[PDB]
């Protein structure tokens, strides 16, 4: 599970900025990982931290 679920967030966040913001291309993806920057790296450390 876990690993799929982290792949889910990045897949969905593009599918959510396409619906909300109204932008269709790579530039729509781009800024998603702007909020999911430490939500990938920092959470990995605490995932490992248990």
């Amino acid at each position: 599970g876990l690993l799929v679920d982290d792949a889910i967030v990045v897949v969905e966040n593009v599918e959510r900025v396409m619906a909300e913001e109204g932008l269709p291309p790579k530039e729509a993806t781009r800024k998603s990982m702007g909020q999911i920057q430490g939500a990938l790296v920092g959470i990995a450390m605490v995932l490992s931290a248990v």
């Binding site: 599970g1 799929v4 969905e12 959510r16």
Partner: protein, 50 residues
């Protein structure tokens, strides 16, 4: 911090657009573990424990 404020009224807009992930990633996890809980009572009882 990096966006435009909100003590109570920003927690909402946070919890207003991502319950899709936190439900479907949580739902695919439930069903992905469903073959472990039962479905098999011959292979291993360790699948039940996990």
């Amino acid at each position: 911090d990096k966006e435009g404020k909100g003590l109570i009224e920003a927690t909402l807009d946070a919890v207003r657009m991502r319950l899709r992930p936190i439900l479907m990633a949580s739902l695919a996890f439930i069903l992905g573990v469903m073959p472990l809980v039962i479905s098999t009572g011959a292979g291993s009882g360790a699948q039940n424990a996990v």
